[PDB]
């Protein structure tokens, strides 16, 4: 089994909280990610996503075991360097154009990966595209449902902010989510940045009357790129490409760039 025996990790520094679960920096042959979590949490984490199991790719954050004592915890592998997002807009990180192509061709051939595995990561977002010793994407902090009736909205597709579904997501959701990151890499911004109103953005994107102004990317950006862009962001979820074709224009692009 993947269990590991009862106190050999060190857990340090509180990271943080993604779609479930808190982040710890740990020890554990060497430097370790200790997600705490509960037995109902991993359960579901088991059935509705199963990402522990099926995943075995260098684009995609590394399960090494569990824990049971002191507290139930997922260790995987830990990234040394900081996330996308971080990069982007806390650090703003100046990347020549041929890394920017080279993380969104690396973010495509993991997403390209899980939707293989038919795993639709659900929260996908720059945060969750560790740029690890600042060369390797790794995508993790995949999403599960913890809340039932009776947040990050920014790379959420229409459909999913309508929620007119019970399940909104899907293969293109993840798409859109993917545009939203490469708007973030081709522009440096993040997108809606002149609203001040979370409502407004939220019922605007939905409602399809707001959408990121393409007109901001680099003057290096290139052309195939922008329109690429373009096809992941439509807002009929129908309209646009899924990863094999989203893979194959990224891989095509960054060998035609001189
Ligand atoms: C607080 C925040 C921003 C949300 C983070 N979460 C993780 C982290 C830690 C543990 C697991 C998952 N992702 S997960 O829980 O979805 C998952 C698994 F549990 C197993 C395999 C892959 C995987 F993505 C993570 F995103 C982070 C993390 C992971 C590895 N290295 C570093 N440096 N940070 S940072």
Same mark, same amino acid.
């Given at each position: ?88 807009? !806390?650090?703003?990180?100046?990347? /020549?154009? $041929?890394?920017?192509? *080279? ?5 495509? @051939?993991?997403?390209? &990966? ?38 990050? !909205?920014?790379?959420?597709?229409? /459909?999913? $902010?309508?929620?007119? *579904? ?5 293969? @293109?959701?993840?798409? &859109? ?82």
């Amino acid at each position: 089994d993947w269990e590991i025996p009862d106190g050999q990790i060190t857990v340090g520094q509180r990271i943080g909280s993604g779609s479930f679960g808190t982040v710890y920096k740990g020890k554990w042959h060497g430097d370790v990610a200790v997600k705490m979590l509960t037995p109902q949490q991993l359960q579901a984490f088991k059935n509705e996503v199963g990402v522990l199991r099926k995943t075995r790719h260098v684009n995609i954050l590394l399960f090494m075991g569990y824990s049971t004592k002191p507290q139930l915890a997922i260790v995987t592998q830990w990234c040394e360097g900081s996330s996308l997002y971080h990069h982007l807009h !806390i650090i703003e990180t100046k990347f /020549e154009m $041929i890394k920017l192509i *080279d993380i969104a061709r690396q973010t495509a @051939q993991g997403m390209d &990966y899980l939707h293989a595995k038919s795993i639709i990561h659900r929260d996908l977002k720059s945060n969750n595209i560790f740029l690890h010793e600042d060369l390797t994407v790794k995508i993790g902090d995949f999403g599960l449902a913890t809340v039932k009736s009776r947040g990050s !909205i920014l790379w959420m597709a229409p /459909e999913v $902010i309508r929620m007119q *579904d019970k399940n909104p997501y899907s293969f @293109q959701s993840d798409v &859109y989510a993917f545009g939203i990151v490469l708007y973030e890499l081709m522009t440096g911004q993040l997108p809606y940045s002149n609203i001040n109103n979370r409502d407004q953005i939220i019922f605007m994107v939905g409602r399809g009357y707001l959408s990121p102004d393409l007109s901001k990317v680099r003057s290096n950006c290139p052309k195939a790129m922008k329109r690429l862009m373009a096809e992941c962001l439509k807002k009929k979820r129908d309209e646009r490409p899924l990863f094999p074709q989203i893979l194959a224009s990224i891989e095509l692009l960054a060998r035609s760039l001189p």
